[PDB]
Design a protein around this ligand. Sequence first.
Ligand code: MG
Ligand code: MG
Ligand code: MG
Ligand code: MG
Ligand code: MG
Ligand code: MG
Ligand code: MG
Ligand code: MG
Ligand code: MG
Ligand code: MG
Ligand code: MG
Ligand code: MG
Ligand code: MG
Length: 122
Amino acid sequence: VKELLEAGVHFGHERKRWNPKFARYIYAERNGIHIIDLQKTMEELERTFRFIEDLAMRGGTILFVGTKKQAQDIVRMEAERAGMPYVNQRWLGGMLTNFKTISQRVHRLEELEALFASPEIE
RNA sequence: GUCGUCAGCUCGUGCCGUGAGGUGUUGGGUUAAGUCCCGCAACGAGCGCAACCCCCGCCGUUAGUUGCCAGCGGUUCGGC
Ligand SMILES: [Mg+2]
Ligand SMILES: [Mg+2]
Ligand SMILES: [Mg+2]
Ligand SMILES: [Mg+2]
Ligand SMILES: [Mg+2]
Ligand SMILES: [Mg+2]
Ligand SMILES: [Mg+2]
Ligand SMILES: [Mg+2]
Ligand SMILES: [Mg+2]
Ligand SMILES: [Mg+2]
Ligand SMILES: [Mg+2]
Ligand SMILES: [Mg+2]
Ligand SMILES: [Mg+2]
């Protein structure tokens, strides 16, 4: 399943913009485009998903991030539909690094959520 | 007093740099303005700018020893 699916319309990409390090994953270069190794991808998702899995069964919170347009909503949906945090909008200096301060804003959205639904606009 | 009512000066954390330091405050648009929008490795905050105070312009409320025949009556015909 996870095999032929990806093997389908989901393989290879780009051309002449690449770290030679990522090259250990490329199978070939047909049509001038890098043909990523299909199999090598599956082999990886194995170790990955094992961590994805273990990480969830711990109850641990994953932060999703995809500011790129071709995935903006594709994050939104899947993260909400998982109770997990995500950011498809523009990222921010200190999201994690300067947490407490960025968080001050979250709290500010709580404060604003008060008056956004309270009889105090008399 | 003054530069100068100029729109500026700077702080917290993060990030950047061996460091002095940088970012933010820059950049596009906007305004009397670091005014505001937009963007952004910064996110936000403080002293400034504005706004809250006084005068002048229109109008209503309350007050009728100023003004008023607007309105009638008397007039030494002066709102006496
Ligand atoms: Mg949880
Ligand atoms: Mg209400
Ligand atoms: Mg109220
Ligand atoms: Mg100066
Ligand atoms: Mg400066
Ligand atoms: Mg500076
Ligand atoms: Mg420019
Ligand atoms: Mg300001
Ligand atoms: Mg009047
Ligand atoms: Mg008369
Ligand atoms: Mg008469
Ligand atoms: Mg008459
Ligand atoms: Mg009288």
